[model samples]
Structure formats: structure tokens, C-alpha cells
Target: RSARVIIASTRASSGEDRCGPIITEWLAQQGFSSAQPEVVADGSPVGEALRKAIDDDVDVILTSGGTGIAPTDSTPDQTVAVVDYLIPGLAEAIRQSGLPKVPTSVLSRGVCGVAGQTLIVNLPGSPGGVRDGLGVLAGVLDHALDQLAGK
Candidate 1:
């Protein structure tokens, strides 16, 4: 399968992205090839990237950052608007996984769902948060993909 990592940060869009590579590396380990992460400001740009990924028929889209309550943290909102329906358990598990290490992890408004057969998940911005999210994904990602493919 294929994947695309989208980083939602105005700063990262202009300068550096810390979590995109982490997601791509995880995807590689899962045997999924991925495009170089795309960095965009946290807003409609994130939505645009997501729509484009769906249009291009990417298998999975893992997005990092902009899942918080901050004014600019709108990745989830962007995701929600586009996804056909949500996989609530997956998003809840992702947030729960981080709660043990950082209580504030629950504050993440991230979401997971499908759009045009593409699985899109939102992850925290910090590297540690990203890793924690990846750990949760490890257990179910393959299964989820299999189900999506009707296997």
C-alpha cells in the first residue's frame, strides 16, 4: 500500500518538520511506501492536502500536529469535514495511549476515519506524542487496512 504524511504547522511548513519522518519510517516498517511528508499551515491547507491525497488514491494518510484546542489547531476539523465516517475507537485509543505519559494528551482533538477508501488519522505534533500514537497504530493498522480492502 501507499501512504502520505501531512504535517500541520505553519512553522514546519516554512522551516522544519519533526514528526513527518517518524510517520514515514513507521509506514516503511509496515511495508507501505510513502511520499516525502508534506508540511502545511494548520488550517484549510491541511484540508486541501487531505482532499488531494484522497483524489490521488493514497492508501493511508497520517497527519501530525494541529489536533489541539488552540485556535489554529484545526487538523481534526479539517479531517472531520472530509471523512465519510469515523473510527471512534481508534481515535480514543490513540488519545488514551498518551494519557499515561502526558495527562494533557486527552486534550488532543485528533480523529481517525476513512475518505474515499483512504484511512486518515491525526497525531500529535511532538515527537514523543507521535511515537506513542504510532505504538497504538502498530497493533491495529494492518487489520484495519485489511478490513478496508475487504479481505
Candidate 2:
């Protein structure tokens, strides 16, 4: 079981890959060792990425960026297209946990869910936003992954 990080940002594709590395570091420190991060353009289809991850048997797909209200932000639609069942509480809790820190965090339209045992999670484009999302999801993800793995 491994985690694959997808960074959906035009700037990320050029360098740094923004919050992608941050997520990778967080996951790595948490003992998810096989994490690998990739930078994709903002226009890339999130659904296709999810499909491919599922096909590859990826354990976790932690995506950062392309989850906002910008015209190019399409992570939610893409996530909706392919998820078997929504992980509704994850996103809602992220919003609830972030509002006090950043009032605008409520605007995030990202989502989380599972597809054929592959967990797909959409995170914010900003580093701070990704930090908030991570803080809220860390505990849940621990148990959720084991449940998904048939533990």
C-alpha cells in the first residue's frame, strides 16, 4: 500500500509543485513511505487521474490544487465523476476546522472518497490550505485506510 500525490497547478508543473511536497512530507513523517508526487496541469481531468490510480492499485491519491472556485478548478467535478461513495464527513470537517483559521476556506469545493479500494482526496491549492486539510484528515485517514484495506 502506497500513496501517490498529484499536484494540479500550472505553477506546480514548472517547479516546487507547491503543496504537493508538503503533503508528501507530512505523509512520510506519518510512516506512509511509498509516497510519490507528480505535478499536473490545472486543466488535467481529476476523474482520469482517479481512474488511473485505481487501475494502478494505488492505496492513496492525495491531490493538491485545482480544488478552488477558479474556472480551472475542477477537482470536485472530477472526483464526483468516479467515486463509488462520497467521504462526505472528511471534506465537511476540513471546512469546519479551517474556517476559524481562514474564513475563506469554506469556499473550497474539493472532496474525498474511495474507488475500488483506492482512496481519492482533493486538497487545496495553497500551502496553508493544504496544511489545514492535512491537520483535519490525519487521524481519520489512519483508521480509514485500514478499513479500506480490509483490516
Candidate 3:
């Protein structure tokens, strides 16, 4: 009925992650709990963060702060590297959710996929983006995660 979360944020590491609490709170409304976040550099190896989360076998991983066009942005590439399947619609839907408000939201090059039962999604780095993204995710992640869990 719920899943634990790991927030892998590059900016949030320097301060409190902007996305985790909001995501956790939204999920709570749907009956999900999350672990403390694990912050890393934007340039940090994607596989490294992914590998650790998969090793720990958390129900989900939510990433932020590096899914952009910036030189340091690497979450998308890293996500593609480690996941077994890329759920393009999920990522597209998130972008579409925000695109109407901010056309520049297209700069977000985030990715979504599954790794050994762990579902990982890249959320935009801004507070507003997190808000919109979580709003979109709350509706679908539960049922989607259930399928991922073979329910």
C-alpha cells in the first residue's frame, strides 16, 4: 500500500532538499512513507546513487537538481544507464504538466525507469517544479508502483 523513498538531489545536499518533503507529504496522503534523503553532487555518478538505492531495495528513488541542460546535468543519462526500462510517458507527462505554465520547463531532461523493483524518477530542481511534478505523480505512482511490485 506504500513505499519508502530516497531523494537524490544535487542542490538539496547543500541545503534541505526541496522535493523530498513535498513528495513524501503528497505520498503520505496516499499512505506512503520515505527514508531520509541522500544528497550528492549533480555530477555524481548516476549509477552510484542508483546502485546504492537498488542495493538497499527501497520502494522508490526520487531525484532532483540535475535534470537540466546545464553542463553538470547528468541525472537523465545516469538514469538511462541503470534502468531496465524507460517509462517515457511518465517523464513526458511530468513535463507536460509544467509546460503550460513555464515553457522553459522543457529544459528538464529527466528520465524514469525501474531497477530491480526500485522505481526512479527525475524531478525538476525548482520548488515550483517539485510542486507540479509531485501533483502529477501522486495520481499515478501508487498504481504504477503496484504493477512494478507485481501486485
Candidate 4:
């Protein structure tokens, strides 16, 4: 079965201003019929918005942007604060997968974790980077979810 993918682009001022739609389109092309993607404006509180998405009970929450080192980059940190457990392997795998493509991949402070029944992942702001990160985790998402849910 196909997964329900929900995309959230945080912080309005960044390059991810239109990331939600872009990612939504990508997911649609990949055969995810239940994808829903939206943007949250700056200062909207990443943790609260993520919790709401989790409350919606989505299978996955893919967040774009706000993973940098800038003062406004708070998605990763906020996500770490709110999630019940850190899926460090997923985040590390994404970084490792992208290392051959670009050195900047090492600078990404992205994170992956579970909140309630949903899995939240922070991806780099660049559309291509987001795709790369997703590709790295696609194969293991289902198993990870099953483990997290104690299925």
C-alpha cells in the first residue's frame, strides 16, 4: 500500500517558500495519492506545527528548510525537543547518502524522530536536496513505522 505523505515547509523567508507544493507534486508523481503539503510561516513555532501534523495522524511528516545554521533555522532543534525518540540512523543515512554529491550535505542539521504516530523528518531547503534525503529513507520507512508502532 502507498503511504500517506504530509509535507510542511517552515519559515516563510527562506528558499523553501514554495517547497510544499513542489514536494507534493513530486510525491504525486511517485504514486502517493494521499499526499498533502503546506507551508508554515516564520515564527509559527515548528514544534507546535509538527505536533498538530502528528495529531492528524499522518504516516509521515516531511519538513523542508530551517535545517541550516542560521539563527532562524530551528526546525531540527524544535523537532528534537518535541519527539519521543530520535531516529538518528535515518538522519545519518541521509547525510551519508548525499556526501558524494556535495560537501555542504555535512552542514545539514536535519533530524528524524517520532511524535505520537507520525514520523517527522527535517530536510534541506533545496528541492533537490529534499529529494535526495527522501530517496535515502524511502526503503526503510515502512519498517521503521512498524517498529515505532509496535506492530
Estimate, for each residue in 1-151, the C-alpha lDDT of model 2 and write its tens digit. 5788887877656666668678988988877765467677766455566677778787788888887798888878878788898888888887777788688888989899998888888888888888988988786888888998888
Q: Residue 99 of candidate 2: its Cα lDDT?
A: 82
Q: Model 2 clash pairs?
A: none
lDDT of 4 by residue, 63-129 (tens): 8877878777777887888788888888888877778878888888889988777777888887778
- The residue ranges of model 3 lying beyond 4 angstroms of the native Cα positions read 1-16
Scored by TM-score, the top model is 1
How do the predictions measure up, each by TM-score?
A: 0.97, 0.90, 0.86, 0.81
True-structure RMSD for candidate 2: 1.7
Q: Estimate every model's Cα lDDT from 0 to 1.
A: 0.92, 0.80, 0.76, 0.70
Better of 2 and 3 by TM-score: 2
TM-score of 3: 0.86
RMSD value for candidate 1: 0.8
Q: Rank the candidates by TM-score, best first.
A: 1, 2, 3, 4
Q: What digit string (tens of lDDT, one per residue) describes model 1 on residues 36-84?
A: 8889998999999999888889888999999999889999999999999
**Which stretches of model 4 miss by more than 4 angstroms?**
1-18, 29-35
Candidate 2 similarity to native, TM-score: 0.90
